[PDB]
Amino acid sequence: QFAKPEDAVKYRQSALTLMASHFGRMTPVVKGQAPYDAAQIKANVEVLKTLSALPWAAFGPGTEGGDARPEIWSDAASFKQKQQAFQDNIVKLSAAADAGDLDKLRAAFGDVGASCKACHDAYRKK
Amino acid sequence: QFAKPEDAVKYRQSALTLMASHFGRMTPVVKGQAPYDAAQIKANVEVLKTLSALPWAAFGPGTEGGDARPEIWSDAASFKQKQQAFQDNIVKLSAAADAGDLDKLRAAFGDVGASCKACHDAYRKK
Numbered sequence: 001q002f003a004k005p006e007d008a009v010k011y012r013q014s015a016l017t018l019m020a021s022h023f024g025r026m027t028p029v030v031k032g033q034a035p036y037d038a039a040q041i042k043a044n045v046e047v048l049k050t051l052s053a054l055p056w057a058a059f060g061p062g063t064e065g066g067d068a069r070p071e072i073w074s075d076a077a078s079f080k081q082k083q084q085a086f087q088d089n090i091v092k093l094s095a096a097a098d099a100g101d102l103d104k105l106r107a108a109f110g111d112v113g114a115s116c117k118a119c120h121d122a123y124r125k126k
Numbered sequence: 127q128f129a130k131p132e133d134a135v136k137y138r139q140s141a142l143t144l145m146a147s148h149f150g151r152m153t154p155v156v157k158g159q160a161p162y163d164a165a166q167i168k169a170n171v172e173v174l175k176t177l178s179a180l181p182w183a184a185f186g187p188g189t190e191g192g193d194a195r196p197e198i199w200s201d202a203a204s205f206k207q208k209q210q211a212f213q214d215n216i217v218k219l220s221a222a223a224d225a226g227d228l229d230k231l232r233a234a235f236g237d238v239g240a241s242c243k244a245c246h247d248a249y250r251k252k
C-alpha cells in the first residue's frame with residue numbers, strides 16, 4: 001500500500017507509536033498506582049491487539065529505512081519468529097484481560113515488555 | 127494517557143496517518159483499478175473502524191498543537207459533531223463491506239471522503 005519505502009517507514013513508526021501509547025498507558029494500572037477497571041482494560045487491550053498486527057506488513061522487501069537494522073531483511077525467518085512471538089504474548093494479555101484477573105495481567109504485561117526489549121536489541125538501531 | 131500536550135499531538139497525527147493509509151489503500155479497489163476481494167476489504171475496513179475511533183481522545187483540553195486550529199476547542203460541540211458524523215460514515219462503510227457489494231462500497235467510500243474534507247476545511251491549518 002506504499003508508493004515509496006519512505007511511506008512504509010512512516011506507517012510502521014506511526015503504528016509503533018500508537019502501540020506504545022496503548023501498552024504504556026496500562027503501566028500504572030499494572031503497578032497499582034491507578035485503579036483497575038476490568039472493562040476499561042479489556043477495551044484497551046482489544047485496541048492493542050488490533051494495533052499489534054499492523055507494523056509487520058510495513059517491513060516488506062525494500063523498505064529499509066528509519067531505525068530498522070538491515071538484519072530484519074537478511075535474517076527474515078528470525079524476525080518473523082520474533083514478531084509472531086510478540087503477537088502470541090499479546091494473545092495472552094488479551095486472555096488475562098478477558099478473565100479480569102490483575103495477577104494474570106501483570107505477568108502477561110511483563111512478558112510483552114520482554115518481547116519488546118528482545119526485538120529491539122536485535123533489530124532496532126540504538 | 128499523555129504526560130505532555132506534545133504527546134497527544136504525536137498520538138493523533140500517528141492515528142490519522144494510519145487511518146489515511148487504511149482508507150487510501152482502498153481507492154484503487156473503489157475505482158476498479160485493482161480487484162475486489164470481499165474478504166480482504168472486510169478485514170481492512172474492520173482495521174479502519176478501530177483506528178477511526180482513536181484520534182478524538184487526543185484532542186482533549188489543553189492539547190493545542192500541530193496543525194489543529196484553535197476552533198476545535200473554542201467550538202467543541204461542533205467538532206464533536208463532525209467526528210461523530212465521520213464515525214457514522216465509517217459504520218456505513220463497514221456495513222457495505224460486510225454485505226460484499228462494490229456499488230454500496232463506492233458510495234460509502236465517497237461519503238467518508240467528503241466527511242474528511244469537511245472537517246479539514248473547518249479544523250485543520252492549511
Ligand code: HEC
Nearest residue numbers: 013016017020023065066067068082083086116119123124
Ligand atoms: C518484532 C520486532 C519488534 C517488536 C516486538 C517491537 N518493536 Fe518497537 N521497533 C522495532 C523496530 C525495528 C523499530 C524501528 C522502526 C523504524 O524506525 O523503521 C521499532 C521502533 C519503535 C518505536 C519508535 C517508532 C518511531 O516513532 O520512530 C517505538 C515507540 C517502539 N518501537 C515501541 C515498541 C513497543 C512499546 C513494543 C511492544 C509493546 C514494541 N516496540 C515492539 C521492532 C519491534
Ligand code: HEC
Nearest residue numbers: 139142143146149191192193194208209212242245249250
Ligand atoms: C473530525 C475531524 C477530522 C476528520 C473526520 C478527519 N481529519 Fe484529518 N485531521 C484533522 C485535524 C484537526 C488534523 C490536524 C491534527 C494535528 O496536526 O494535530 C488532521 C490531520 C490529518 C493528517 C496529517 C497527520 C500528520 O501526519 O500530521 C492526515 C494524514 C489526515 N488528517 C488524514 C485524514 C483522513 C484520510 C481522514 C478520514 C479517512 C481524516 N483525516 C479525517 C481532522 C480530521
